[PDB]
Amino acid sequence: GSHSMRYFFTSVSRPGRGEPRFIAVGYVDDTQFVRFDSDAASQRMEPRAPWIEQEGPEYWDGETRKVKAHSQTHRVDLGTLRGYYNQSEAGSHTVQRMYGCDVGSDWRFLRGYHQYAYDGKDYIALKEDLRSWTAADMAAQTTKHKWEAPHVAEQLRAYLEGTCVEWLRRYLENGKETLQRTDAPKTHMTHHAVSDHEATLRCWALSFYPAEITLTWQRDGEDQTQDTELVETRPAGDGTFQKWAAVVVPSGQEQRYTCHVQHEGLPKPLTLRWE
Amino acid sequence: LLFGYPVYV
Amino acid sequence: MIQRTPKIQVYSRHPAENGKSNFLNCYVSGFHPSDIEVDLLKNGERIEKVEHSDLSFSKDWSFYLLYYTEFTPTEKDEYACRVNHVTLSQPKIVKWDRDM
């Protein structure tokens, strides 16, 4: 299948209560491999996947130096953005940053990305050409001009299209058993009477990896989209994911309804039913 | 591997 | 200024069966800002040994966390997750329902 490496960074200012909170996590596909937390004891980038543990001290020292430069960059940004939007010193504000790269199933570069948000709203984001920024407002156009200066634009380019890709592949190789795997959902349905004329039908998918899954209910072939309760895909905690979709069915009509599961693990999409 | 050159907004 | 409500799910890692050790999860997602308080409850008492995931977010910027603890389900013990967040005028209690 296709693969991705993503880093996610959150900084939250906390006026009067010391330095801003900074959390960074990296992921290959839906598996976390590293963390940094400004509030933890170590003040180091820390392993979170068994396969990354084999990296030497040059890796750990360098990622720690690098993650701390991201921390410091965000600490300045928080003041900068408060000045750009004329906000007071007293409130808490959030900056979020995500970047990374996708590769196709031949492991060659597909796309690279770098997106930034301020208070949960889009701020600036890099287009697919890795050169042009989409800027939210006037404040972000100032950011755009800084970041599109040719020296700066090139360091980012060389990261996303080169380094990010090379290290993703290295990680894919080193963590083969975890990362180059597909776990097909284990599926079942349940039925519960909410009254003597109505029943909840619930379609379950358990133990699947990667997280991407589509679970939909049909009534005689028509999509029951506005009448389905569909929960957010959620982690089991052991490296696999879970999801369910539920419909409330007038009792006697169970056979009309089919659940449909699509997942890269299934060779053919499944159709489940009360026959 | 992290990006080596984050720049201020 | 952006505020999104957490969607709270309480659930076990494995299909629950009485007498086997499992893991009790409270997944909170879809929320903004990041400040959130999450407790797992056993018979309405706060469970003290509770780990949580590293703060992360989805494409739409909204946060998610998993809170988790080892437990052995029995027939009688009631489990729940209690969540507080700026979007909630009081803490929200979601009971564990094994039979879902």
Assign residue C76 the CATH number of its domain.
2.60.40.10
Residue A45: exposed, middle, or buried by beta-carbon count in 10 A (0-12, 13-18, 19+)? Answer: buried
CA A33 from chain centre, in angstroms, equals 13
| The pair of three-digit structure tokens given for residue A253, joined into one six-digit string | 């009509």
* Contact present, A103 and A109 (Cβ < 8 Å): yes
| The pair of three-digit structure tokens given for residue A87, joined into one six-digit string | 């906000």
CA B3 from chain centre, in angstroms, equals 5
Chains C and B: 3 or more CB pairs within 8 Å of each other: no
A209–chain C nearest CA distance, Å: 14
A185–chain B nearest CA distance, Å: 31
Residues of C with CB below 8 A from A121's CB?
2, 61
Which residues belong to CATH 3.30.500.10 in chain A?
1-182
Q: Which CATH number fits domain A1-182: 3.40.50.10320, 3.40.50.2300, 3.40.190.10, 3.30.500.10?
A: 3.30.500.10
Residues of C with CB below 8 A from A232's CB?
7, 9, 27, 29-30, 64
> How many helices (H) and strands (E) are present in chain C, helices listed first?
0, 9
* Contact present, A184 and A266 (Cβ < 8 Å): yes
Cis check for the bond before A210: say yes or no (omega within 30 of 0): yes
- C-alpha A93/C-alpha A84 separation (Å) is 13
Which residues belong to CATH 2.60.40.10 in chain A?
183-270
* Contact present, A10 and C57 (Cβ < 8 Å): yes
For β-strands A198-208 and A241-250, DSSP reports them as antiparallel
| The pair of three-digit structure tokens given for residue C84, joined into one six-digit string | 């507080």
Single-letter amino acid, residue C30 = G
Classify A183-270 by CATH class.
mainly beta
Per the document, the length of chain A is 275
Cβ-based neighbours of A224, under 8 Å, separated by 6 or more: A216, A217, A218, A247, A257
Measured CA distances, A215 to A12, A232, A247, C26, C58 (Å): 35, 11, 12, 22, 19
